[PDB]
């Protein structure tokens, strides 16, 4: 029950999706060929939330892939855990959006959205209870942002009752790959504010800092950061996938978090992450889990929360622990960091305790914080955009494909309204 379709776009989204799928398979105990190889029965009673029973006793994931270039196709196929995805869901183009948003949202992606919608309708008509969608795509890539936001508008004008979540990986401000990034970033943040319910930003700067100071790695490979985001993605709903002393879902998140129909941009955090050399010393208990979770540089967003506050903070625990200890630590941490939690909402922290830890751990902690700190991130991306726009830098590449500057003007206006909203709520007190 409560099925969930996975959608991927752009090469970044596709790498993250392949990583997430191999992690989920290795949790539910599904070999790369598509059969069960675990021991318990929990991992099979809730198989239908993600996978489908494939004709012949196989299992295939209910995920769809898209990209305007066909390199990612053979990449994910040759890669580990590729035999699962069914050969139908691979819808792909040849031209390639080529890092130009208007391409992947008005010109070419506009040619494939019909087919992608047909296949999504064939995968959503065959479910009985559809708890919602979740997406994964980079907000800088033309294919990623364009295809994604167009698909989002389509499905959210299609299925208004269900939710729409996006594991979006925003451009890391400092460590920046491409120089036409702010245009795509702002043209996607104007769309995601319309037709989305949970948008958790992830920036490569925080991931590099984590893989570079906490795990004490040496050569941070893109596969590794992808794996970290995959772990967070699993932990998000693994409280739903398995029984728990205090169960949860996606909509209890959607209600216990966003106090205003648009203030829906979350920060993620995983715990516990520690190096191998120090692995044998520290303990796996909820005290250290708490001290490691709330750290500023434990998260996946380059926004030191000490430059803001939290409107709300959910914590999905996994494993088996005495809930009273968890709740006492929550009460103590709130009454210890009373400033960081905004006052006009009382007991703004939420918990949810599941029963099965991941593969290889005793406890695990996902920390989802809707804060008023990432307004700073949006602010600085707006700075980039303005300094790139008022000289019309690289503007003709967008103007050519039909989009008019009015879109950019109104979208920057909407972004400024979003950040003004965040600040206007951090300000008001009672």
């Amino acid at each position: 029950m409560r099925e969930i379709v996975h959608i991927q776009g752009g090469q970044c989204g596709n790498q993250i999706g392949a990583k997430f799928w191999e992690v989920i398979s290795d949790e539910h105990g599904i070999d790369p060929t598509g059969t069960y190889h675990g021991d318990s029965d929990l991992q099979l009673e809730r198989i239908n939330v993600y996978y489908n029973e494939a004709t012949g006793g196989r299992y295939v994931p209910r995920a769809i892939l898209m990209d305007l270039e066909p390199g990612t196709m053979d990449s994910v196929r040759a890669g580990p855990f590729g035999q699962l995805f069914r050969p139908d869901n691979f819808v792909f183009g040849q031209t390639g959006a080529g890092n130009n948003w208007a391409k992947g949202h008005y010109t070419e992606g506009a040619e494939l959205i019909d087919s992608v919608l047909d296949v999504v309708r064939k995968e959503a008509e065959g479910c009985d209870c559809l708890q919602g969608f979740q997406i994964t795509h980079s907000l800088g890539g033309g294919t990623g942002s364009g295809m994604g936001t167009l698909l989002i508008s389509k499905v959210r004008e299609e299925y208004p009752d269900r939710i729409m979540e996006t594991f979006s990986v925003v451009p890391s401000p400092k460590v920046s790959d491409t120089v036409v990034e702010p245009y795509n970033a702002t043209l996607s943040v104007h769309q995601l504010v319309e037709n989305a319910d949970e948008c958790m930003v992830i920036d490569n700067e925080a991931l590099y800092d984590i893989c570079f100071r906490t795990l004490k790695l040496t050569t941070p490979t893109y596969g590794d950061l992808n794996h970290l985001v995959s772990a967070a993605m699993s932990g998000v709903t693994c409280c739903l996938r398995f029984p728990g002393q205090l169960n949860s879902d996606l909509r209890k998140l959607a209600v216990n978090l966003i106090p205003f129909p648009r203030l829906h941009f979350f920060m993620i955090g995983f715990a516990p992450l520690t190096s191998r050399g120090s692995q044998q010393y520290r303990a796996l208990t909820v005290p250290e889990l708490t001290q490691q979770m709330f750290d500023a540089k434990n998260m996946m967003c380059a926004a030191d929360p000490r430059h803001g506050r939290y409107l709300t903070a959910s914590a999905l625990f996994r494993g088996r622990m005495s809930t009273k200890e968890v709740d006492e630590q929550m009460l103590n941490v709130q009454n210890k960091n009373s400033s960081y939690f905004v006052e006009w909402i009382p007991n703004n922290i939420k918990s949810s305790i599941c029963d099965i830890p991941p593969k290889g751990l005793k406890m695990a902690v996902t920390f989802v914080g809707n804060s008023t700190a990432i307004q700073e991130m949006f602010k600085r991306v707006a700075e980039q955009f303005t300094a790139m726009f008022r000289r019309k830098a690289f503007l003709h590449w967008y103007t050519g494909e039909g989009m008019d500057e009015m879109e950019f003007t109104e979208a920057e206006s909407n972004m400024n309204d979003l950040v003004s909203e965040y600040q206007q709520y951090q300000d008001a007190t009672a």
Partner: protein, 429 residues
Amino acid sequence: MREVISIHVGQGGIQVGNACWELFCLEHGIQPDGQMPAFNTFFSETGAGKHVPRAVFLDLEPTVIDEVRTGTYRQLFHPEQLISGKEDAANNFARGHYTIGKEIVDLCLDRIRKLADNCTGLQGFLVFNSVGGGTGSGLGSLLLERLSVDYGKKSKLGFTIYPSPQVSTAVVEPYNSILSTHSLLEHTDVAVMLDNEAIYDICRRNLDIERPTYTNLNRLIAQVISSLTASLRFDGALNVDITEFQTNLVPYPRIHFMLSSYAPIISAEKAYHEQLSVAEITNSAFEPANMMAKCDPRHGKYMACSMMYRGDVVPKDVNASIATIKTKRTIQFVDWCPTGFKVGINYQPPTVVPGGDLAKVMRAVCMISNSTAIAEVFSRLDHKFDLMYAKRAFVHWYVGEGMEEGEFSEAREDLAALEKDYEEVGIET
């Protein structure tokens, strides 16, 4: 389902083409006989047996193309795509653009169409041409105009071997350079300034080859082109399409003149005595000396940097080193571009051509930078132009072919407007 078309027109163009196809056939191991013991970007399979390259070789002097018809690769290319004229262009643009080219453009377009119909995901053309020459200028401009009116949306990239500032090898080469720009200013999306002075300086300092010859030059250029196309050909963490280039690096559709750079170019005996850390290699990347074109990028401000690495690359640490180079207080960008560098990664390490002076090293950064320094070249070049056209030197050898006289001045004014842009766009706001 992702391919290109490589037009080699002119003398220097076809020499660099010979070398570059050497490289391409080698790294895919495609034997020079034409039989292989991923290549759909360049070589197409003929249903069974052998492969044929996607390249037309336009030229009018049968000397070099004939040597190719008898070289080591006599059995590789298709016996038709090697077009040979009857006479020469003789450095005067009017010839290779009005009298002769009027006859060969038809055959070239027929060949180009017959190749493009045999592909499914064409992305961009890759022309190669010198400018000082006649054919590499006239015929290049003519083809660019015809393809632009015939295809439309597709993106064209050029590799122009401009005249060096001081060291020269022709005399009228300023003239049939300026005109070649007044065409190439429009029908092409990216023009990379590959000069001959900077490359000889480089081979005199880095590879320590004391007496550099055109072969080593073309080898280095082939290396850069392969490092560019590695994104389509081979696998990679961060693929870049040859079409996102017109999006990243061409801010104002008129100012699309970019200069390249390559690292690391070392000979063995100092190669062993060096670690070549990613920080070090990318720090040699921005160094003004080894810029592939003759300029001092310090003199102006950068506008965009497409940096593609190939080999073992630790991404987040590359990010750290790029940040450090952004701290280097001598390379500063214009106000209107805060999103400084665009990057790309590929796993395929540099492939060394056997016998070549270059040593096989694990990592390699190829950096295509659009700056404002490049402007001065045009300025300096116009100088030469001035000192001739004021006295009508050599003009009659142009007006002989029916080319209108005054066009020069017109073209000149157009190129003067280039500075109306360059020293302008570098102004803060």
